[PDB]
Design a protein around this nucleic acid. Structure first.
Ligand SMILES: Nc1ncnc2c1ncn2[C@@H]1O[C@H](COP(=O)(O)OP(=O)(O)O)[C@@H](O)[C@H]1O
Ligand SMILES: Nc1ncnc2c1ncn2[C@@H]1O[C@H](COP(=O)(O)OP(=O)(O)O)[C@@H](O)[C@H]1O
Lengths: 343, 628
DNA sequence: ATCGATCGTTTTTTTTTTTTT
DNA sequence: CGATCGAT
């Protein structure tokens, strides 16, 4: 539900169960396992989803007035049509608080902003509305990324890299505020990702701007004929019965939903000494990467994302001070999908 | 009569502030004292002070205001009478403030009228001044016409019965535009609060009006705090209002107008906040109440002399605005000269002479060349930034129209173009199309530009400098081709830009770990930044002062900038065999204002040959930096 | 001054061609 | 449906 803040306050009895959930080291996988209603294949990313479920940390910059580094969290899913990215995330539109669902060729750049035209209410025309500035902090499930004109997608550079807007038209001229996190379901110019041609070029984008992203946890068809039958039968029987069971996958009515909700507000991850120093040592070989012909490599924006991931995963477990394990799942998150182009 | 209590109330409010009002002092007599000579008739009054002395007339005020409002003007006149030999020319504009409650477009009913509430929103589709001669003189035709009465109502009616005679009571006299009562307003519209952005419904818009002193100080992109003078609107005709209709059918013994009223809104206070800067005579947080050229222009000389005297403050100030940053220490000293003044001569009708200088950044990827400038929009006034592809070539131009709204063709502004005496830098100078590029090819140098195809005698002008964002072909500085092929760009702009300062990347572990050692004091949430030498307030005030000086050259290096420049082109007599390069007098112009600004640092006039030598050093730096 | 008989009274539309960037 | 205008 929505974000008034005042009309959503929870009782202490629910806090019992919330910190109960927090009392599971199983909680690292429980809510990611409670993401799907019934989908039981290779949820290994749903932990990577969940850092945006628990939608990011608030590293404010009311401190120095300088450099305004939000804990910017940006991840996209990309792969083949087999994956239910559109349908998963059509359902996740029925999850996200600021649920949006547009995609390539639903609305232009001005189809996202400045819906300007006549108004017979005033008997005059007016400067008027947009899309993103309504979705601050939110998400739009998005597909068919490689579909838009260059007019759009050079806006996204602006926001993804500054999270800003300053506008100039003949009528109103504006320097507004706009900022949020991604979900998307980009696709290539192909039907299947071409074997022996990485998404380094398969999806249609430039040389190191492809490299620029934090990490897009790759998707692709499961290359195994066998497992179809299991769920072709189980999740058709799901329809055949037209109801569920509260099995070990205990689907909470709302006990899941306030650990989502309440854990946006009263939490403030802090760093003492834990989740920083590993790559602050290992950067030797992490920046022996200067060598390479036409490649894309390691850069010193990675650790920014690492700290952000870290405070995110400390959001789960509610560790007011730093979590250290978050590093380990961060390194896992990386090198499960950073060796997709060793070539 | 009802409001005689309000009469006596503001009467004895005057009579109290006729004595002291605040510590033997009054806050609303010296505004009135400045009023007394021109008699402009605007004085804001603190709403708190009603609760201070009048003891909660707020609730005596904030409902029956619209009816009580006029009596405040009579009260005002009674104030001005007591000590000034007075005529009734006096009037009452008010720009109320010191009010707590802040409501929005939704709590609207029949019950919301005659209040003073403060409200914000946005500003859109503005509209112009349109005067009003609200009053005049009008009665029967013969002689008995001297009519300064109450005839100024919104609903206007020439027809009056009589004053002295039995005479015409529909046949009127003629009009007075000469010695009577007139005033002004405008009319604009407002969209829903961007601080209150719910789902579903539209941005419900309100009508808005402004009195005299409020005028032409509203503007697009701004939020406000109004009065709460919601209205019965003296409207004239409308459709769809098919409710019951009434009118007075008088006494039987032995004109018509359909009634459907609409809504608008009116207001008599503004604090256009988030749009307020103030130059240097404004007392800041840190001041020194002293005597000076002006009020506070440099009345902190008590320190600014010190901030203009050290031989260390150069490097200290180079380090007093990059606490969270570490890189080379050449742009950290050069880039400020872009923000720092130039030449400012006082000279002939030859042609416009320029003060500003072109400025560049190039570097390898992920070097925080952006973070140099991401802050600069938050830093300087007039100088707001976005990208060039952040808009179209309705960045330079306006949005080109081919439909009829007012006269069917409108390109009269832009986005680069409204940066008058601030810079609006841009990123990504390499892949942008060659339209604004060739526009800038002269718009930076010959800051007097024109267009065709829609021109209302097109003559526009750039005003400030620039910041560049190049990156090489391969993403790396692989020394496998010449610079002219390393960037694949043109000559004259590589000479128009008299200052390059490229930021090259390497791999040495101590560097990167030293950066993470910066990070040691980036999230230590107490002490997440490094020490400094000079607070920002004094910094910008010294900057705001150091221009007003008339910089000068009479120096033998001014005489023998011929010598240093002759050597400049002596050593650059080559730069022609191995990958030839070009020298040009824009370089001299740039060095000139560069040396001049370098002495403007000194809070002093009158250039010194030290500045020439450092400028020569820096030009040598840039040109040998251009060497492959 | 009062009443009554005199005088004079009117408003409704939406869309297609060539032009300019 | 309005104002002019005449006499009673
Ligand atoms: N785990 C799953 N649960 C339900 N449906 C699935 C699952 N995996 C695949 N699908 C099916 O695969 C299809 C995915 O297509 P879709 O993702 O919408 O194409 P695109 O990848 O272009 O968005 C959907 O119709 C969906 O029903
Ligand atoms: N000396 C430094 N001080 C602060 N941040 C730095 C420094 N060097 C590198 N960085 C970081 O490296 C990143 C550089 O990315 P950036 O250069 O903006 O990308 P691009 O190369 O696309 O412009 C920034 O986020 C910045 O925080």
């Amino acid at each position: 539900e929505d974000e008034e803040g005042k009309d959503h306050i929870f009782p202490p009895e629910r806090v019992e169960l919330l910190q109960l959930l927090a009392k599971k080291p199983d909680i690292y996988d429980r809510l990611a396992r409670a993401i799907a209603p019934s989908i039981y294949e290779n949820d290994d990313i749903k932990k990577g989803i969940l850092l945006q479920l628990f939608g990011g940390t608030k590293k404010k910059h009311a401190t120095l007035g300088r450099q305004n580094f939000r804990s910017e969290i940006h991840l996209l899913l990309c792969g083949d049509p087999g994956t239910s990215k559109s349908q998963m995330l059509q359902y996740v539109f029925n999850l996200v608080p600021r649920s949006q669902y547009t995609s390539g060729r639903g609305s232009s750049a001005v189809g996202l902003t400045a819906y300007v035209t006549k108004d017979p209410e005033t008997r005059q025309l007016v400067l008027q509305t947009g899309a993103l500035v309504l979705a601050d902090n939110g998400v739009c499930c998005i597909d068919e990324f490689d579909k838009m004109n260059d007019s759009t997608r050079s806006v996204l550079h602006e926001v993804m890299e500054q999270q800003t807007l300053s506008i100039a038209k003949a009528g109103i001229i504006c320097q507004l505020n706009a900022r949020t996190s991604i979900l998307a379901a980009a696709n290539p110019a192909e039907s299947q990702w071409n074997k022996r041609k990485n998404i380094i070029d398969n999806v249609q984008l430039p040389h190191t701007l492809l490299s620029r992203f934090d990490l897009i946890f790759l998707v692709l068809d499961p290359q195994d004929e066998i497992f179809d039958k299991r769920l072709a039968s189980h999740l058709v029987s799901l329809y055949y019965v037209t109801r569920h069971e509260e099995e070990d996958t205990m689907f909470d009515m709302s006990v899941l939903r306030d650990y989502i909700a309440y854990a946006r507000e009263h939490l403030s991850p802090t760093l003492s000494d834990e989740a920083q120093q590993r790559l602050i040592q290992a950067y030797v070989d992490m920046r022996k990467v200067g060598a390479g012909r036409g490649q894309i490599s390691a850069y010193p924006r990675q650790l920014e994302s690492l700290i952000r991931l870290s405070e995110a995963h400390a959001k789960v477990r509610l560790s007011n001070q730093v979590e250290l394990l978050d590093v380990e799942e961060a390194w896992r998150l990386h090198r499960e999908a950073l060796k997709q182009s060793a070539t | 009569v009802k409001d005689e209590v309000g009469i006596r109330a503001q009467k004895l409010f005057q009579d109290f502030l006729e004595e002291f009002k605040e510590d033997g002092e009054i806050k609303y007599t010296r505004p009135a004292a400045s009023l007394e000579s021109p008699d402009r008739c605007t004085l804001e009054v603190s709403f708190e002070d009603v609760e201070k002395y009048d003891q909660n007339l707020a609730t005596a005020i904030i409902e029956e205001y619209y009816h009580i409002y006029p009596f405040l003007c009579q009260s005002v006149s009674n104030y001005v009478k007591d000590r000034i030999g007075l005529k009734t020319q006096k009037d009452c504009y008010v720009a109320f403030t010191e009010v707590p409650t802040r409501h929005k477009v939704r709590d609207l009913t029949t019950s919301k009228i005659g209040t003073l509430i403060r409200i914000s929103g946005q500003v859109v589709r503005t509209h112009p001044v349109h005067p009003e001669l609200v009053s005049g003189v009008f009665m029967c035709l013969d002689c008995q016409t001297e009519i300064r009465n109450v005839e100024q109502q919104f609903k206007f009616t020439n027809p009056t019965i009589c004053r002295n005679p039995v005479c015409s009571n529909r046949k009127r006299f003629m009009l007075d535009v000469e010695k009577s009562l007139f005033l002004d307003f405008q009319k604009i519209r407002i969209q829903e609060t961007q601080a209150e952005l719910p789902r579903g419904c539209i941005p419900r818009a309100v009508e808005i009006i402004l009195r005299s002193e409020l005028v032409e100080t509203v503007q697009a992109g701004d939020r406000y705090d109004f009065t709460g003078t919601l209205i019965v609107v003296p409207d004239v005709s409308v459709l769809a209002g098919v409710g019951t209709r009434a009118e007075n059918s008088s006494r039987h013994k032995p004109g018509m107008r359909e009634l459907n009223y609409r809504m608008a809104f009116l207001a008599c206070s503004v604090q256009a906040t988030t749009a307020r800067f103030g130059g240097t005579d404004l007392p800041m947080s840190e001041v020194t109440a002293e005597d000076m050229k002006k009020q506070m222009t440099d009345a902190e000389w008590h320190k600014i002399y010190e901030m203009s005297k050290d031989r260390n403050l150069y490097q200290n100030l180079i380090s007093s605005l990059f606490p969270s940053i570490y890189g080379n220490d050449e742009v950290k000293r050069g880039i400020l000269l872009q923000q720092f003044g130039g030449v400012a001569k006082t000279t002939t009708e030859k042609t416009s002479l320029r003060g500003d200088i072109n400025v560049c950044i190039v570097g390898d990827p992920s070097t925080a060349k952006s973070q140099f400038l991401k802050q600069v929009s938050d830093f300087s006034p007039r100088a707001i930034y976005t990208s060039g592809k952040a808009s179209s070539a309705a960045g330079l131009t306006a949005a080109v129209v081919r439909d009829e709204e007012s006269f069917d063709f409108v390109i009269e502004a832009g986005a680069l173009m409204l940066a008058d005496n601030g810079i609006c830098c841009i990123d990504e100078f390499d892949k942008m199309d060659q339209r604004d590029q060739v526009a800038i090819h002269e718009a930076m140098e010959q800051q007097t530009i024109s267009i065709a195809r829609a021109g209302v005698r097109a003559t526009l002008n750039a005003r400030t400098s620039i910041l560049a964002a190049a990156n090489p072909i391969n993403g790396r500085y692989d020394r496998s081709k010449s610079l002219q092929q390393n960037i694949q760009l043109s000559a004259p702009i590589m000479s128009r830009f008299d200052l390059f300062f490229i930021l090259v990347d390497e791999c040495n572990e101590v560097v990167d770990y030293a950066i993470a050692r910066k990070i040691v004091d980036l999230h230590s949430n107490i002490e997440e930044s490094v020490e400094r030498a000079y607070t920002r307030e004094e910094v910008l005030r010294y900057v705001t002062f150091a221009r007003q000086f008339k910089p000068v050259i009479s120096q033998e290096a001014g005489h023998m900038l011929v010598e240093n420049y002759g050597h400049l082109r002596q050593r650059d007599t080559g730069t022609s065999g191995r990958s030839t390069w070009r020298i040009t007098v824009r370089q001299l112009e740039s060095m000139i204002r560069l040396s001049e600004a370098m002495a403007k640092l000194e809070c002093s006039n009158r250039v010194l040959e030290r500045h020439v030598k450092e400028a020569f050093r820096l030009l040598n730096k840039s040109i040998i930096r251009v060497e492959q």
